[PDB]
Coordinates of C-alpha atoms and ligand atoms in Angstrom, one line a residue:
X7 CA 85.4 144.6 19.7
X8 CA 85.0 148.1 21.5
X9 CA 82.3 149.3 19.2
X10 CA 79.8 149.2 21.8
X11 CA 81.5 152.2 23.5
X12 CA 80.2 154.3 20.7
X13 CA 76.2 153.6 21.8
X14 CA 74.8 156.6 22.8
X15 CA 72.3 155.7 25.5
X16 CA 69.8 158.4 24.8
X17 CA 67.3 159.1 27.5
X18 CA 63.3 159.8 27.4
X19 CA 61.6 162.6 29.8
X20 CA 58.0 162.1 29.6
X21 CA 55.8 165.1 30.0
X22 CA 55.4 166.4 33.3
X23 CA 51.8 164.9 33.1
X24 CA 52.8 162.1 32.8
X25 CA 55.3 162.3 35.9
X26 CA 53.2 163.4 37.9
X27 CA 50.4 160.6 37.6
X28 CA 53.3 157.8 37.1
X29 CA 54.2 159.4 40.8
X30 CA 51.2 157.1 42.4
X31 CA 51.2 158.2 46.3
X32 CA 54.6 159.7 47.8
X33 CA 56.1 160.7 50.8
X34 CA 58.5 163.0 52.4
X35 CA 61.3 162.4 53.8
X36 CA 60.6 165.1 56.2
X37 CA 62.9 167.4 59.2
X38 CA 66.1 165.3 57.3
X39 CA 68.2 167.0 54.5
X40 CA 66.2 170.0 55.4
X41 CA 66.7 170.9 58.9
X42 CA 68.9 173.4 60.2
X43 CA 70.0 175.7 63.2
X44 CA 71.2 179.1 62.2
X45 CA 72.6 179.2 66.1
X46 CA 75.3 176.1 64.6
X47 CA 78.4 175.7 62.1
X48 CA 78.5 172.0 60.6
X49 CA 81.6 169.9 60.4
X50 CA 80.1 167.0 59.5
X51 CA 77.1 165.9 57.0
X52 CA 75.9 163.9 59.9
X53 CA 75.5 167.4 62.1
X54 CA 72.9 168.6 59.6
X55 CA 70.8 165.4 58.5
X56 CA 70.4 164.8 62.6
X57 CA 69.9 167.8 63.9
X58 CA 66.1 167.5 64.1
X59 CA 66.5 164.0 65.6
X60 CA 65.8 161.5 62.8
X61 CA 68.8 159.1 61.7
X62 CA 70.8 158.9 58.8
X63 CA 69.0 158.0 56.3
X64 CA 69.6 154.6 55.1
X65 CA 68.8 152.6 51.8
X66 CA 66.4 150.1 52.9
X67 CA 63.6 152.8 54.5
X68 CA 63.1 153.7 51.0
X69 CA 62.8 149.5 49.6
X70 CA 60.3 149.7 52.6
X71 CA 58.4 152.6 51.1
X72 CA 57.9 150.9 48.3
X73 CA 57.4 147.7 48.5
X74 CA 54.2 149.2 50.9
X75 CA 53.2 150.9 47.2
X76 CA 54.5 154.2 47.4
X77 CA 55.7 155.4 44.1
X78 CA 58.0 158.4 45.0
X79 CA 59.7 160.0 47.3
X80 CA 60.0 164.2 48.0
X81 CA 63.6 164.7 49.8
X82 CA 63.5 168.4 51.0
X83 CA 67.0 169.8 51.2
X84 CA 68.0 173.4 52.9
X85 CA 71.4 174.6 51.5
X86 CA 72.6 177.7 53.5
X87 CA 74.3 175.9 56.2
X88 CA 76.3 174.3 53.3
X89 CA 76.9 177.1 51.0
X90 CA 80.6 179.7 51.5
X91 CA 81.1 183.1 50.8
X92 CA 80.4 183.2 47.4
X93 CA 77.4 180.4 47.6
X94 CA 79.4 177.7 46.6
X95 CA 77.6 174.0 48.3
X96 CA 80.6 172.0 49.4
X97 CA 81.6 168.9 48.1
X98 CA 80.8 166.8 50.9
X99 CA 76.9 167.7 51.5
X100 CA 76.2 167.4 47.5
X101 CA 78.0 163.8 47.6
X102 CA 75.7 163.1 51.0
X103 CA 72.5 164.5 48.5
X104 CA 73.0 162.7 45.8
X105 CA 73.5 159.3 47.9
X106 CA 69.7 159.7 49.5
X107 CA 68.5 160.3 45.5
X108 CA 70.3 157.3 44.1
X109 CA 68.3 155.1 47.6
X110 CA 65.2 156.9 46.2
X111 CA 65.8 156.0 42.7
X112 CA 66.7 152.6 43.2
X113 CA 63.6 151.4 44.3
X114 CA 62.2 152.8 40.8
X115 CA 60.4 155.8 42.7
X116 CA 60.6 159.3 41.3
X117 CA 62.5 161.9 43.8
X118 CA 61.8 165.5 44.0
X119 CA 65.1 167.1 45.3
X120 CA 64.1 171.1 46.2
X121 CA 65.8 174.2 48.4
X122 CA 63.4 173.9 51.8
X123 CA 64.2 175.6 54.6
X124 CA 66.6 178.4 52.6
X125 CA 62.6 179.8 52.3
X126 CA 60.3 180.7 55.0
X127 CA 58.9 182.2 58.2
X128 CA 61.6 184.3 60.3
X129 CA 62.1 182.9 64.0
X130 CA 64.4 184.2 66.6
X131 CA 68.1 183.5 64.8
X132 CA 66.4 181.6 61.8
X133 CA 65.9 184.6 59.2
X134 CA 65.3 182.8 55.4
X135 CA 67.0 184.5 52.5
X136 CA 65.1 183.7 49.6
X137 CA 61.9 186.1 50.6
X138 CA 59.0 187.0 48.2
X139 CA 60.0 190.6 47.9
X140 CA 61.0 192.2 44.6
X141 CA 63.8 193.8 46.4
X142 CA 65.0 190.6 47.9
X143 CA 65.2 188.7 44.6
X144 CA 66.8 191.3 42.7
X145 CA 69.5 191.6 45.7
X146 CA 69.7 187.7 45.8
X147 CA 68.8 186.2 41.6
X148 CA 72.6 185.5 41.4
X149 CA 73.4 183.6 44.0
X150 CA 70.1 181.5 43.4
X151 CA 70.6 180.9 40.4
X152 CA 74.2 179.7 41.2
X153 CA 72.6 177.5 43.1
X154 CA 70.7 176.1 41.1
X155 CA 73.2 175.9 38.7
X156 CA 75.4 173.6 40.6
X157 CA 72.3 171.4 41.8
X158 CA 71.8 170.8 37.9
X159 CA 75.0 170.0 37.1
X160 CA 75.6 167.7 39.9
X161 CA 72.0 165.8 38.9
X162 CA 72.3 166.6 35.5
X163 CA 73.0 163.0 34.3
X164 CA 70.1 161.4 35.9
X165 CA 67.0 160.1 33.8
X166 CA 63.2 161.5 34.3
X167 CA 62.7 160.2 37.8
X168 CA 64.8 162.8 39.5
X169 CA 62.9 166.3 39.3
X170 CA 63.9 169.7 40.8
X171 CA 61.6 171.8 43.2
X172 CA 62.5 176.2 42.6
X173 CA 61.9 176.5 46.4
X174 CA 59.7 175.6 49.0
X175 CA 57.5 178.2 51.1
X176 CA 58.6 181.5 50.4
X177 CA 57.3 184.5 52.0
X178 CA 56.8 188.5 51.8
X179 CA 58.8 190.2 54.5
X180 CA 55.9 189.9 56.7
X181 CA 56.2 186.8 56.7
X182 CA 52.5 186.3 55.4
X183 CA 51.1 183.1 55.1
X184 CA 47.9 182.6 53.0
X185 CA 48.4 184.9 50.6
X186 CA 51.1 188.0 49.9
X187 CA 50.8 190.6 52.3
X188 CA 48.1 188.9 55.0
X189 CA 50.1 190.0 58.0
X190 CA 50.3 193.7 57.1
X191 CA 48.0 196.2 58.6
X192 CA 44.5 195.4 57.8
X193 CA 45.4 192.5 56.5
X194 CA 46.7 193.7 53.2
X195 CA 49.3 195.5 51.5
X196 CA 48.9 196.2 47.7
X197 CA 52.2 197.4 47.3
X198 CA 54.0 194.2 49.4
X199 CA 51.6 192.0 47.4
X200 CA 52.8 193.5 44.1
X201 CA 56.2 192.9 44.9
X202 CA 56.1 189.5 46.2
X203 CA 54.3 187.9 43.3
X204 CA 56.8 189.7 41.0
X205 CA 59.6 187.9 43.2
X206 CA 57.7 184.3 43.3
X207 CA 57.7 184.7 39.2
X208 CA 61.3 185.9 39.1
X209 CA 62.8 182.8 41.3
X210 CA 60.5 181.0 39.2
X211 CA 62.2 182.2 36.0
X212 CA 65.7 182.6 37.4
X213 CA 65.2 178.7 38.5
X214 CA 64.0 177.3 35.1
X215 CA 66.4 179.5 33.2
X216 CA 69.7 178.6 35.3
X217 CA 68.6 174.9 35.3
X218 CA 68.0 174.4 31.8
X219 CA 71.2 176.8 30.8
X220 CA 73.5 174.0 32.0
X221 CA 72.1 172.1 29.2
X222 CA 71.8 167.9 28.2
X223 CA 69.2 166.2 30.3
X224 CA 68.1 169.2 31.5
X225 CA 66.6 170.3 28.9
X226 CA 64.2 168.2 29.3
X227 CA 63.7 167.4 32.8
X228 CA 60.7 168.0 34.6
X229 CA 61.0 170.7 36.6
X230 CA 58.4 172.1 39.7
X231 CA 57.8 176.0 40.6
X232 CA 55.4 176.3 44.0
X233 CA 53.2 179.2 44.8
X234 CA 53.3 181.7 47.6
X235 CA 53.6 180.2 50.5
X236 CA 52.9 176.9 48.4
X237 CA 49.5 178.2 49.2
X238 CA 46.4 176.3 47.6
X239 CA 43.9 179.0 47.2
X240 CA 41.1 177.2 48.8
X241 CA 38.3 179.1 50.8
X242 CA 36.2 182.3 50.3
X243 CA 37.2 183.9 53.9
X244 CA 39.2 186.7 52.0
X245 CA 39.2 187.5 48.3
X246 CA 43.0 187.1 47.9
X247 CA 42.8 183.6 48.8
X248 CA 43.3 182.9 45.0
X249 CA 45.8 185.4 44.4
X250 CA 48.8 183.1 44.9
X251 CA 47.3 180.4 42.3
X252 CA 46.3 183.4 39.7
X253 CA 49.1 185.6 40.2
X254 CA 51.9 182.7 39.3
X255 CA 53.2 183.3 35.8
X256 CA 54.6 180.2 34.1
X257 CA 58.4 180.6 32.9
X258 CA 58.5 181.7 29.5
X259 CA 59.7 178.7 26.8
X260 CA 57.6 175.9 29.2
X261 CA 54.7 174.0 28.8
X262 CA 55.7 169.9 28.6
X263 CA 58.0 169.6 31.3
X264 CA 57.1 171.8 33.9
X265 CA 54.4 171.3 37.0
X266 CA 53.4 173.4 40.0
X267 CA 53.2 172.6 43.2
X268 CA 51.3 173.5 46.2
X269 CA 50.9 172.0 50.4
X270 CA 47.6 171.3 51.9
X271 CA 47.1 170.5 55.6
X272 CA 43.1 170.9 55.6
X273 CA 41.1 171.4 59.4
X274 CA 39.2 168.4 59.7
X275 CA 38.7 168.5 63.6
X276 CA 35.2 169.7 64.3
X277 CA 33.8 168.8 60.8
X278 CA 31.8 166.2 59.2
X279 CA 33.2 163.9 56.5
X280 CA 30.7 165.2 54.2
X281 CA 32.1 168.6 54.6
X282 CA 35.5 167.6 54.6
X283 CA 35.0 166.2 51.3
X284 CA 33.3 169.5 49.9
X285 CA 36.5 171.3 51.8
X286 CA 38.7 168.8 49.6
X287 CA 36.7 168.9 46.4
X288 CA 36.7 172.8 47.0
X289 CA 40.7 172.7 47.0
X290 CA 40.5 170.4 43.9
X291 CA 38.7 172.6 42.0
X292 CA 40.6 175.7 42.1
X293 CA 44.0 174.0 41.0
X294 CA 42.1 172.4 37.9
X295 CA 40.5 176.2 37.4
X296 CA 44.5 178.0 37.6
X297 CA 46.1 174.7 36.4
X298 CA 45.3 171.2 35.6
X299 CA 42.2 172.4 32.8
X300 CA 45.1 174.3 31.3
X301 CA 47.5 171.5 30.4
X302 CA 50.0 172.4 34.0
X303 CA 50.4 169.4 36.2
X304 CA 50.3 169.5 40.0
X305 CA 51.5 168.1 42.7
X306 CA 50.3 168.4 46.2
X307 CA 54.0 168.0 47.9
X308 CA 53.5 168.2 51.5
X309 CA 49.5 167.1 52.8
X310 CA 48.2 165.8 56.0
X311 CA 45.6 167.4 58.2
X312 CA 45.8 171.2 60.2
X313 CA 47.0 169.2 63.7
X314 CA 49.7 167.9 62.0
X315 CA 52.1 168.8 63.9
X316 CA 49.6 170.0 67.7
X317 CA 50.8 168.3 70.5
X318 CA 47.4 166.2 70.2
X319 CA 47.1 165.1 66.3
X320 CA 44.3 164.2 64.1
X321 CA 45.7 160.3 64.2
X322 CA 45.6 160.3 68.0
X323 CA 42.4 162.3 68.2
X324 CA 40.1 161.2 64.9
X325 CA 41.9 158.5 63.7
X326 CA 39.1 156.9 61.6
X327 CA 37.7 160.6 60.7
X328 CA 40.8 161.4 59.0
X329 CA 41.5 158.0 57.6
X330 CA 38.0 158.5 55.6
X331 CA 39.5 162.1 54.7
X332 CA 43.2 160.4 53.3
X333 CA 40.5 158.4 51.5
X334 CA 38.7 161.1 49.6
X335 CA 41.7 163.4 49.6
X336 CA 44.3 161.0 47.0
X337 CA 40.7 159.7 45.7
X338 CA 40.1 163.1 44.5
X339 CA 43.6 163.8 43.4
X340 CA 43.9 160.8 41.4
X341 CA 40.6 161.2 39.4
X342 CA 42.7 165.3 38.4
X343 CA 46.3 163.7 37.3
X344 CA 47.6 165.4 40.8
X345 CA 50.0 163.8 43.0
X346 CA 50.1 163.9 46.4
X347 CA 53.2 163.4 48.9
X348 CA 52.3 162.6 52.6
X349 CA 54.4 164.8 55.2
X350 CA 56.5 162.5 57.8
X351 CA 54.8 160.6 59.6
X352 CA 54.7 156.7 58.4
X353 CA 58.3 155.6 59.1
X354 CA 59.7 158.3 62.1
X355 CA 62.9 158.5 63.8
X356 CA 64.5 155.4 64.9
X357 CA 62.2 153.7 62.8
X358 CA 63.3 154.7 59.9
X359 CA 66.5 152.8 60.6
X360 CA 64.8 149.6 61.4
X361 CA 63.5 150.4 58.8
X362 CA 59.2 149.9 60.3
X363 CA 56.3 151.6 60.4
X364 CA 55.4 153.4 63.5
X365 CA 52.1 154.3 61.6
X366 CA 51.7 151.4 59.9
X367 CA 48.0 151.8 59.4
X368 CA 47.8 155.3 57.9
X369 CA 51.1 153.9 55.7
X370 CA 48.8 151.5 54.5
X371 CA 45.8 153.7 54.6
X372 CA 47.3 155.9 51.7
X373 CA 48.5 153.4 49.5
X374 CA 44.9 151.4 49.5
X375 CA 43.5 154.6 49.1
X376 CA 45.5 154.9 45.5
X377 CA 46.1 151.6 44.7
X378 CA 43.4 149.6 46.1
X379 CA 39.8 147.9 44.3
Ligands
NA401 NA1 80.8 172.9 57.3

């Protein structure tokens, strides 16, 4: 009578391709899991998922989200406020990480679960530790890969919808956005350059490798590496602008199960909509040249437009001109296989415990934009 405890409930993983266009539109659960304050010591789980002033997050937002045709959900996480000594997460943040996944995930939705704000741009006591510098990642491989090690092993019984992010913005040691080495004298620096794409493709490596060494599901689980800076290569203003998209090397051993990612917050302010949709079709077409024509997924995990986050933004300023560019922009993404994930916005702050939209017409905007005839 107990012989089906024997059934072995084997699970499928798609290809990434396939993820990444089951994804539909998605959404991130923004300035959450992923905010910090080097100038602070937590106590409490609540300390860190507040401290940028949105609630704790809640089941129902994520019902919301869907049910307004969203089809996944990015949950940016920063670990070094929640790491000892030896780089050991405690027990009581992974349970508190794994509770927003199993909210994602029980709306159907894929989640993207990533280390955030452990990468980045230096500011007063905020200094990030995983840095695109050769130095850096040979000083710091072991205790990323622990890391990613326990993230894997504490996800590692979860189906294809969860996937893992390597990092999320890293940087030289200038700091550089754009491309490797932008902020140096003269705008360049062959031997910083060197060295940071050498470190984006050893995190990249030491994050596939350390996942898929702790063995089962992931295996097979589809996993995201990111660019420099998660830059996207568009423009012609400088002839490095590629270099982060051509310089990426894909992890030895992968090819069905592994996507990269890059941001995009294009300037629309000042422009037409026809040249916004050249800017856009411009962005497309150098992650189908690096990417998507070779058989590598990608997903576009943070977009909105450059004003973002100016004290006057696109949606109070342009509101029509950049709902005609959300349009175009998961239009043109959907006809390449490449997902797109909306930053914030949509459901902010104390709404999100309602749950509502504050921005219930650009919510509605993107999913009609994807989804609508
Ligand atoms: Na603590």
């Amino acid at each position: 009578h107990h012989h089906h405890h024997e059934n072995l409930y084997f699970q499928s993983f798609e290809t990434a391709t396939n993820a990444v266009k089951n994804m539909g539109v998605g959404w991130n659960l923004g300035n959450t899991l992923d905010a910090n304050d080097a100038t602070k010591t937590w106590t409490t789980t609540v300390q860190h998922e507040t401290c940028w002033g949105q609630p704790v997050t809640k089941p129902e937002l994520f019902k919301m989200m869907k049910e307004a045709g969203f089809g996944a959900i990015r949950v940016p996480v920063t670990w070094y406020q929640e790491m000892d000594a030896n780089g050991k997460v405690n027990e009581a943040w992974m349970k508190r990480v794994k509770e927003v996944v199993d909210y994602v995930v029980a709306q159907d939705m894929y989640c993207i679960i990533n280390v955030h704000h452990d990468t980045g741009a230096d500011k007063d006591a905020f200094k990030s530790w995983i840095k695109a510098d050769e130095a850096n990642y040979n000083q710091n491989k072991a205790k990323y890969e622990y890391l990613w090690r326990q993230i894997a092993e504490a996800f590692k019984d979860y189906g294809d919808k969860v996937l893992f992010e390597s990092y999320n913005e890293m940087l030289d040691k200038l700091n550089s956005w754009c491309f490797a080495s932008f902020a140096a004298s003269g705008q360049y620096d062959a031997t910083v350059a060197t060295s940071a794409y050498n470190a984006i493709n050893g995190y990249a490596r030491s994050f596939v490798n350390a996942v898929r060494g702790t063995g089962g599901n992931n295996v097979r689980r589809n996993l995201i590496v990111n660019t420099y800076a998660a830059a996207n290569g568009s423009g012609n203003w400088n002839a490095h602008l590629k270099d982060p998209l051509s310089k990426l090397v894909i992890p030895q051993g992968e090819r069905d199960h592994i996507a990269v990612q890059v941001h995009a917050y294009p300037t629309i302010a000042g422009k037409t909509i026809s040249a916004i949709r050249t800017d856009t079709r411009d962005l497309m077409n150098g992650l189908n040249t690096y990417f998507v024509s070779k058989g590598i997924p990608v997903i576009i995990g943070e977009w909105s437009t450059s004003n973002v986050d100016a004290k006057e933004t696109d949606y109070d300023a342009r509101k029509s001109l950049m709902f005609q560019f959300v349009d175009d922009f998961v239009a043109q993404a959907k006809a390449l296989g490449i997902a797109t994930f909306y930053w914030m916005g949509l459901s902010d702050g104390a709404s999100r415990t309602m749950p509502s939209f504050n921005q219930a017409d650009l919510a509605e905007r993107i999913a009609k934009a994807y989804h609508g005839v």
